[PDB]
Protein backbone atom coordinates (compact mmCIF):
# COMPACT_ATOMS: atom_id res chain seq x y z
CA UNK A 1 0.00 0.00 0.00
CA UNK A 2 1.20 3.50 -0.77
CA UNK A 3 1.44 5.90 2.15
CA UNK A 4 2.70 9.40 2.72
CA UNK A 5 6.40 9.38 3.57
CA UNK A 6 7.62 11.30 6.59
CA UNK A 7 10.43 13.80 6.14
CA UNK A 8 12.79 11.72 8.22
CA UNK A 9 15.17 14.65 8.68
CA UNK A 10 12.34 16.92 9.81
CA UNK A 11 11.21 14.31 12.32
CA UNK A 12 14.69 14.44 13.86
CA UNK A 13 14.28 18.19 14.42
CA UNK A 14 10.65 18.48 15.48
CA UNK A 15 8.75 16.79 18.30
CA UNK A 16 5.04 16.80 19.08
CA UNK A 17 3.76 18.77 22.06
CA UNK A 18 0.17 19.16 23.22
CA UNK A 19 -0.67 22.19 21.07
CA UNK A 20 2.38 22.54 18.82
CA UNK A 21 5.90 21.36 18.14
CA UNK A 22 9.06 21.83 20.15
CA UNK A 23 12.52 22.33 18.72
CA UNK A 24 16.07 23.10 19.71
CA UNK A 25 17.59 26.44 18.84
CA UNK A 26 20.35 27.23 16.37
CA UNK A 27 23.78 28.88 16.91
CA UNK A 28 24.95 26.54 19.68
CA UNK A 29 27.07 23.99 17.81
CA UNK A 30 30.44 25.75 17.67
CA UNK A 31 31.96 29.25 17.83
CA UNK A 32 31.03 29.72 21.48
CA UNK A 33 33.89 31.67 23.11
CA UNK A 34 32.83 34.98 21.56
CA UNK A 35 29.19 34.50 22.50
CA UNK A 36 27.99 36.16 25.71
CA UNK A 37 26.90 33.93 28.57
CA UNK A 38 23.42 35.39 28.27
CA UNK A 39 23.21 34.05 24.72
CA UNK A 40 24.68 30.69 25.76
CA UNK A 41 22.02 30.51 28.48
CA UNK A 42 19.12 31.63 26.32
CA UNK A 43 19.96 29.60 23.20
CA UNK A 44 19.92 26.45 25.33
CA UNK A 45 16.70 24.48 25.54
CA UNK A 46 13.43 24.14 23.74
CA UNK A 47 11.54 26.68 21.69
CA UNK A 48 8.16 26.20 20.11
CA UNK A 49 7.83 26.07 16.34
CA UNK A 50 6.48 29.36 15.00
CA UNK A 51 2.82 29.59 14.04
CA UNK A 52 3.85 30.58 10.51
CA UNK A 53 6.02 27.44 10.25
CA UNK A 54 3.71 24.82 11.78
CA UNK A 55 1.82 24.33 8.51
CA UNK A 56 5.05 23.28 6.81
CA UNK A 57 5.96 21.16 9.83
CA UNK A 58 2.60 19.40 9.55
CA UNK A 59 3.10 18.85 5.81
CA UNK A 60 6.57 17.41 6.54
CA UNK A 61 5.73 15.15 9.51
CA UNK A 62 2.20 13.93 8.78
CA UNK A 63 2.23 11.04 11.30
CA UNK A 64 3.42 12.96 14.36
CA UNK B 1 -45.09 -3.73 18.44
CA UNK B 2 -48.41 -5.59 18.69
CA UNK B 3 -49.29 -6.98 15.26
CA UNK B 4 -51.70 -9.55 13.86
CA UNK B 5 -51.20 -12.35 11.38
CA UNK B 6 -53.51 -12.72 8.39
CA UNK B 7 -55.52 -15.27 10.36
CA UNK B 8 -55.64 -13.12 13.50
CA UNK B 9 -53.01 -14.50 15.86
CA UNK B 10 -51.31 -11.78 17.89
CA UNK B 11 -47.54 -11.43 17.52
CA UNK B 12 -45.33 -9.24 19.71
CA UNK B 13 -42.29 -7.77 17.96
CA UNK B 14 -39.67 -5.55 19.57
CA UNK B 15 -39.86 -1.80 19.02
CA UNK B 16 -36.08 -1.57 18.55
CA UNK B 17 -36.25 -3.87 15.52
CA UNK B 18 -39.72 -3.03 14.19
CA UNK B 19 -40.54 0.39 15.66
CA UNK B 20 -37.39 2.46 15.23
CA UNK B 21 -38.14 5.92 13.82
CA UNK B 22 -37.41 6.36 10.12
CA UNK B 23 -34.01 7.83 9.22
CA UNK B 24 -34.21 8.51 5.50
CA UNK B 25 -30.61 9.74 5.22
CA UNK B 26 -29.30 6.53 6.80
CA UNK B 27 -31.62 4.38 4.69
CA UNK B 28 -30.46 6.25 1.60
CA UNK B 29 -26.80 5.72 2.39
CA UNK B 30 -27.28 2.01 2.98
CA UNK B 31 -29.47 1.49 -0.11
CA UNK B 32 -27.07 3.46 -2.30
CA UNK B 33 -24.11 1.51 -0.93
CA UNK B 34 -25.95 -1.71 -1.72
CA UNK B 35 -26.53 -0.52 -5.27
CA UNK B 36 -22.88 0.48 -5.70
CA UNK B 37 -21.97 -3.01 -4.50
CA UNK B 38 -23.77 -4.47 -7.50
CA UNK B 39 -21.35 -2.85 -9.93
CA UNK B 40 -18.77 -5.08 -11.59
CA UNK B 41 -16.52 -2.14 -12.49
CA UNK B 42 -14.93 -4.03 -15.39
CA UNK B 43 -13.81 -1.73 -18.19
CA UNK B 44 -10.78 0.04 -19.58
CA UNK B 45 -9.63 2.40 -22.25
CA UNK B 46 -6.09 2.89 -23.56
CA UNK B 47 -3.68 5.66 -22.74
CA UNK B 48 -1.24 7.06 -25.28
CA UNK B 49 1.25 4.51 -23.96
CA UNK B 50 -1.01 1.53 -24.62
CA UNK B 51 -2.44 2.41 -28.03
CA UNK B 52 -0.73 0.62 -30.93
CA UNK B 53 2.39 2.22 -32.38
CA UNK B 54 3.03 5.88 -31.75
CA UNK B 55 6.72 5.70 -30.90
CA UNK B 56 8.22 8.08 -33.47
CA UNK B 57 7.92 11.86 -33.69
CA UNK B 58 5.54 12.40 -36.66
CA UNK B 59 7.58 15.25 -38.15
CA UNK B 60 10.51 17.36 -37.07
CA UNK B 61 9.92 19.99 -34.41
CA UNK B 62 10.59 23.15 -36.44
CA UNK B 63 10.30 24.22 -40.05
CA UNK B 64 7.37 22.26 -41.48
CA UNK B 65 4.79 24.93 -40.63
CA UNK B 66 2.81 22.43 -38.57
CA UNK B 67 1.75 22.31 -34.96
CA UNK B 68 4.41 20.33 -33.13
CA UNK B 69 3.64 16.69 -32.47
CA UNK B 70 5.30 14.05 -30.33
CA UNK B 71 3.26 10.95 -31.14
CA UNK B 72 0.50 9.98 -33.55
CA UNK B 73 -1.28 8.47 -30.54
CA UNK B 74 -1.52 11.65 -28.51
CA UNK B 75 -4.97 12.23 -26.97
CA UNK B 76 -5.42 15.23 -29.28
CA UNK B 77 -5.32 13.05 -32.41
CA UNK B 78 -8.06 10.92 -33.86
CA UNK B 79 -7.07 7.39 -32.93
CA UNK B 80 -4.93 8.61 -30.05
CA UNK B 81 -4.93 7.41 -26.49
CA UNK B 82 -7.41 8.58 -23.91
CA UNK B 83 -6.12 11.25 -21.59
CA UNK B 84 -7.37 9.76 -18.33
CA UNK B 85 -8.27 6.40 -19.80
CA UNK B 86 -10.47 4.44 -17.43
CA UNK B 87 -9.27 1.30 -15.65
CA UNK B 88 -11.23 -1.25 -13.60
CA UNK B 89 -12.65 0.17 -10.37
CA UNK B 90 -13.92 -1.26 -7.09
CA UNK B 91 -17.26 0.37 -6.30
CA UNK B 92 -18.03 -1.36 -3.01
CA UNK B 93 -18.41 0.85 0.05
CA UNK B 94 -17.76 0.29 3.71
CA UNK B 95 -21.12 0.56 5.41
CA UNK B 96 -20.80 0.40 9.20
CA UNK B 97 -22.29 -2.68 10.83
CA UNK B 98 -24.51 -0.57 13.07
CA UNK B 99 -25.52 1.67 10.17
CA UNK B 100 -26.59 -1.36 8.13
CA UNK B 101 -28.47 -2.80 11.09
CA UNK B 102 -30.17 0.50 11.87
CA UNK B 103 -31.16 0.93 8.24
CA UNK B 104 -32.73 -2.53 8.18
CA UNK B 105 -34.52 -1.58 11.40
CA UNK B 106 -35.75 1.67 9.85
CA UNK B 107 -36.91 -0.13 6.71
CA UNK B 108 -38.87 -2.78 8.62
CA UNK B 109 -40.54 -0.18 10.83
CA UNK B 110 -41.48 1.91 7.78
CA UNK B 111 -42.94 -1.16 6.07
CA UNK B 112 -45.19 -1.77 9.07
CA UNK B 113 -46.05 1.93 9.22
CA UNK B 114 -47.30 1.93 5.62
CA UNK B 115 -48.90 -1.52 5.90
CA UNK B 116 -46.60 -3.18 3.36
CA UNK B 117 -45.61 -5.93 5.82
CA UNK B 118 -47.82 -9.00 6.25
CA UNK B 119 -47.21 -11.54 9.01
CA UNK B 120 -48.25 -15.12 8.35
CA UNK B 121 -47.95 -18.11 10.65
CA UNK B 122 -46.32 -20.09 7.84
CA UNK B 123 -46.16 -20.35 4.05
CA UNK B 124 -45.64 -23.95 2.91
CA UNK B 125 -46.32 -25.05 -0.66
CA UNK B 126 -46.90 -28.81 -0.81
CA UNK B 127 -45.95 -29.30 -4.47
CA UNK B 128 -43.43 -27.48 -6.69
CA UNK B 129 -46.30 -25.89 -8.60
CA UNK B 130 -46.53 -22.24 -9.62
CA UNK B 131 -50.33 -22.12 -9.60
CA UNK B 132 -50.46 -23.22 -5.96
CA UNK B 133 -48.34 -20.27 -4.87
CA UNK B 134 -50.32 -17.94 -7.14
CA UNK B 135 -53.52 -19.01 -5.38
CA UNK B 136 -51.92 -18.78 -1.92
CA UNK B 137 -50.73 -15.25 -2.69
CA UNK B 138 -54.04 -14.16 -4.22
CA UNK B 139 -55.83 -15.10 -1.01
CA UNK B 140 -53.19 -13.18 0.96
CA UNK B 141 -53.90 -10.27 -1.45
CA UNK B 142 -50.20 -9.80 -2.25
CA UNK B 143 -49.69 -10.91 -5.87
CA UNK B 144 -46.48 -8.82 -5.99
CA UNK B 145 -44.51 -9.83 -2.94
CA UNK B 146 -41.23 -10.67 -1.30
CA UNK B 147 -41.83 -13.77 0.83
CA UNK B 148 -39.32 -13.86 3.69
CA UNK B 149 -39.21 -17.19 5.51
CA UNK B 150 -36.60 -18.87 7.62
CA UNK B 151 -35.43 -22.08 5.91
CA UNK B 152 -36.84 -21.50 2.43
CA UNK B 153 -38.34 -24.79 1.32
CA UNK B 154 -36.87 -26.48 -1.74
CA UNK B 155 -40.22 -26.54 -3.53
CA UNK B 156 -41.63 -23.20 -2.41
CA UNK B 157 -38.53 -21.90 -4.19
CA UNK B 158 -39.61 -23.75 -7.34
CA UNK B 159 -43.19 -22.52 -7.05
CA UNK B 160 -41.97 -18.94 -6.71
CA UNK B 161 -39.30 -19.04 -9.43
CA UNK B 162 -41.59 -18.23 -12.37
CA UNK B 163 -43.93 -15.66 -10.79
CA UNK B 164 -42.88 -12.23 -12.14
CA UNK B 165 -42.99 -9.77 -9.21
CA UNK B 166 -42.57 -12.42 -6.53
CA UNK B 167 -39.35 -13.45 -4.84
CA UNK B 168 -38.77 -15.88 -1.97
CA UNK B 169 -35.88 -15.19 0.40
CA UNK B 170 -34.52 -16.66 3.59
CA UNK B 171 -33.98 -14.14 6.37
CA UNK B 172 -30.18 -14.31 6.05
CA UNK B 173 -30.21 -13.28 2.37
CA UNK B 174 -32.71 -10.44 2.69
CA UNK B 175 -31.29 -7.07 1.63
CA UNK B 176 -32.54 -3.49 2.04
CA UNK B 177 -33.21 -3.02 -1.66
CA UNK B 178 -35.24 -6.23 -1.76
CA UNK B 179 -37.20 -5.03 1.27
CA UNK B 180 -37.94 -1.72 -0.46
CA UNK B 181 -38.42 -2.91 -4.04
CA UNK B 182 -41.42 -5.24 -3.71
CA UNK B 183 -45.00 -4.06 -3.31
CA UNK B 184 -45.60 -6.27 -0.28
CA UNK B 185 -43.48 -8.30 2.10
CA UNK B 186 -44.89 -11.54 3.50
CA UNK B 187 -42.82 -12.44 6.56
CA UNK B 188 -43.43 -15.53 8.63
CA UNK B 189 -43.53 -15.10 12.39
CA UNK B 190 -40.37 -17.20 12.66
CA UNK B 191 -38.56 -14.82 10.30
CA UNK B 192 -39.86 -11.84 12.28
CA UNK B 193 -38.34 -13.39 15.41
CA UNK B 194 -35.06 -13.94 13.56
CA UNK B 195 -35.10 -10.27 12.60
CA UNK B 196 -35.71 -9.38 16.24
CA UNK B 197 -32.57 -11.31 17.18
CA UNK B 198 -30.39 -10.08 14.30
CA UNK B 199 -31.32 -6.42 14.74
Amino acid sequence: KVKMKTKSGAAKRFKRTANGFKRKQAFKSHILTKKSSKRIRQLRGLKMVDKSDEAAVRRMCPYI
Amino acid sequence: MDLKTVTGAAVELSDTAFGREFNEALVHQVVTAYLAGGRQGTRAQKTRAEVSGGGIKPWRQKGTGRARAGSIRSPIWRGGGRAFAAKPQDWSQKVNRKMYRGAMQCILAELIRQERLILVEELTISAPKTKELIAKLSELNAPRALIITKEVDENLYLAARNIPHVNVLDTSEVDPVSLIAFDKVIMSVEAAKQFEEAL
Partner: protein, 144 residues
Protein backbone atom coordinates in the same frame (compact mmCIF):
# COMPACT_ATOMS: atom_id res chain seq x y z
CA UNK C 1 -39.20 1.65 3.60
CA UNK C 2 -40.14 4.28 1.06
CA UNK C 3 -39.69 3.60 -2.63
CA UNK C 4 -36.31 3.31 -4.32
CA UNK C 5 -37.70 6.31 -6.18
CA UNK C 6 -37.84 8.68 -3.23
CA UNK C 7 -34.87 8.27 -0.91
CA UNK C 8 -32.71 11.35 -0.40
CA UNK C 9 -29.32 11.82 1.29
CA UNK C 10 -30.44 14.89 3.23
CA UNK C 11 -29.24 18.48 3.07
CA UNK C 12 -25.51 18.96 3.47
CA UNK C 13 -24.77 15.28 2.90
CA UNK C 14 -23.73 15.75 -0.73
CA UNK C 15 -21.62 18.40 -2.41
CA UNK C 16 -21.05 18.63 -6.14
CA UNK C 17 -17.42 18.44 -7.18
CA UNK C 18 -15.50 21.18 -8.95
CA UNK C 19 -14.68 20.74 -12.63
CA UNK C 20 -11.93 23.07 -13.81
CA UNK C 21 -11.95 24.59 -17.28
CA UNK C 22 -15.63 24.35 -18.23
CA UNK C 23 -16.37 27.92 -19.29
CA UNK C 24 -16.71 31.39 -17.85
CA UNK C 25 -19.92 30.96 -15.86
CA UNK C 26 -18.56 28.16 -13.69
CA UNK C 27 -15.94 30.40 -12.06
CA UNK C 28 -13.22 27.88 -12.97
CA UNK C 29 -12.82 28.28 -16.73
CA UNK C 30 -9.60 28.74 -18.66
CA UNK C 31 -6.82 28.50 -16.05
CA UNK C 32 -8.98 26.57 -13.56
CA UNK C 33 -8.03 28.56 -10.47
CA UNK C 34 -4.29 28.18 -11.05
CA UNK C 35 -3.75 31.84 -11.95
CA UNK C 36 -1.23 32.68 -14.65
CA UNK C 37 1.89 31.12 -16.12
CA UNK C 38 4.36 30.23 -13.42
CA UNK C 39 5.69 26.96 -12.01
CA UNK C 40 2.50 26.44 -9.99
CA UNK C 41 0.22 26.77 -13.03
CA UNK C 42 2.06 23.91 -14.81
CA UNK C 43 0.89 20.31 -14.89
CA UNK C 44 3.09 18.22 -12.66
CA UNK C 45 3.53 21.10 -10.24
CA UNK C 46 3.62 20.56 -6.50
CA UNK C 47 4.26 22.37 -3.28
CA UNK C 48 7.61 20.80 -2.43
CA UNK C 49 7.56 20.00 1.27
CA UNK C 50 10.33 21.71 3.24
CA UNK C 51 11.37 23.95 0.34
CA UNK C 52 11.60 27.71 0.90
CA UNK C 53 12.76 28.70 -2.59
CA UNK C 54 16.46 27.98 -1.98
CA UNK C 55 16.83 29.51 1.46
CA UNK C 56 17.97 26.73 3.76
CA UNK C 57 14.74 25.25 5.15
CA UNK C 58 13.70 25.40 8.80
CA UNK C 59 14.36 21.76 9.61
CA UNK C 60 17.88 22.14 8.26
CA UNK C 61 18.46 25.45 10.05
CA UNK C 62 17.75 23.72 13.29
CA UNK C 63 19.73 20.94 14.98
CA UNK C 64 18.66 17.36 15.43
CA UNK C 65 18.08 16.50 19.05
CA UNK C 66 17.37 13.45 21.15
CA UNK C 67 17.57 9.72 20.70
CA UNK C 68 14.72 7.24 20.33
CA UNK C 69 14.21 4.86 23.24
CA UNK C 70 13.25 1.25 22.62
CA UNK C 71 11.99 0.93 26.20
CA UNK C 72 9.22 3.48 25.59
CA UNK C 73 7.93 1.43 22.65
CA UNK C 74 6.76 -1.37 24.95
CA UNK C 75 5.41 0.67 27.89
CA UNK C 76 1.69 1.43 27.74
CA UNK C 77 -0.06 4.01 29.91
CA UNK C 78 -3.51 2.91 31.07
CA UNK C 79 -6.23 5.29 32.20
CA UNK C 80 -8.56 4.58 35.10
CA UNK C 81 -11.52 5.18 32.79
CA UNK C 82 -10.47 2.37 30.42
CA UNK C 83 -10.75 -0.29 33.12
CA UNK C 84 -14.44 -0.94 32.43
CA UNK C 85 -13.22 -3.11 29.53
CA UNK C 86 -11.58 -5.60 31.92
CA UNK C 87 -13.14 -9.01 32.57
CA UNK C 88 -12.81 -9.78 36.27
CA UNK C 89 -11.14 -8.03 39.18
CA UNK C 90 -7.44 -8.73 38.56
CA UNK C 91 -5.57 -6.02 36.63
CA UNK C 92 -2.32 -7.33 35.19
CA UNK C 93 -0.54 -6.82 31.87
CA UNK C 94 -2.10 -10.01 30.47
CA UNK C 95 -5.56 -8.87 31.57
CA UNK C 96 -5.01 -5.47 29.94
CA UNK C 97 -3.95 -7.24 26.75
CA UNK C 98 -7.04 -9.43 26.64
CA UNK C 99 -9.12 -6.32 27.30
CA UNK C 100 -7.28 -4.71 24.34
CA UNK C 101 -6.43 -1.68 26.47
CA UNK C 102 -2.75 -2.19 25.67
CA UNK C 103 -1.20 -3.73 22.58
CA UNK C 104 -0.39 -7.42 22.78
CA UNK C 105 3.36 -6.75 22.48
CA UNK C 106 3.51 -4.22 25.31
CA UNK C 107 5.77 -5.45 28.09
CA UNK C 108 4.99 -2.89 30.81
CA UNK C 109 1.93 -0.92 31.82
CA UNK C 110 1.38 2.20 33.93
CA UNK C 111 -1.96 3.13 35.50
CA UNK C 112 -2.48 6.89 35.72
CA UNK C 113 -5.19 9.07 37.22
CA UNK C 114 -7.32 10.05 34.23
CA UNK C 115 -10.89 8.98 34.90
CA UNK C 116 -12.40 7.17 37.86
CA UNK C 117 -12.64 3.50 38.79
CA UNK C 118 -16.14 2.12 39.32
CA UNK C 119 -15.24 -1.14 41.10
CA UNK C 120 -12.47 -2.68 43.18
CA UNK C 121 -9.55 -4.14 41.24
CA UNK C 122 -6.33 -5.93 42.19
CA UNK C 123 -3.42 -4.40 40.28
CA UNK C 124 -0.63 -6.99 40.24
CA UNK C 125 2.32 -6.19 38.00
CA UNK C 126 1.74 -2.61 36.88
CA UNK C 127 3.06 0.76 37.99
CA UNK C 128 0.47 3.00 39.64
CA UNK C 129 0.83 6.75 40.10
CA UNK C 130 0.10 8.53 43.38
CA UNK C 131 -3.34 9.84 42.45
CA UNK C 132 -4.23 6.63 40.67
CA UNK C 133 -3.27 4.63 43.76
CA UNK C 134 -5.34 6.81 46.06
CA UNK C 135 -8.33 6.60 43.70
CA UNK C 136 -7.97 2.82 43.43
CA UNK C 137 -8.04 2.30 47.17
CA UNK C 138 -10.83 4.87 47.49
CA UNK C 139 -12.88 2.66 45.18
CA UNK C 140 -11.72 -0.24 47.35
CA UNK C 141 -9.06 -2.05 45.34
CA UNK C 142 -5.48 -2.95 46.20
CA UNK C 143 -2.08 -2.77 44.52
CA UNK C 144 0.41 -5.62 44.79
Amino acid sequence: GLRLNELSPGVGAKKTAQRRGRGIGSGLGKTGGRGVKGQKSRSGSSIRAGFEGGQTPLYRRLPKFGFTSKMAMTTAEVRLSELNKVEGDVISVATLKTANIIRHDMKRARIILSGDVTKAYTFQGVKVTKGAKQAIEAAGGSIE
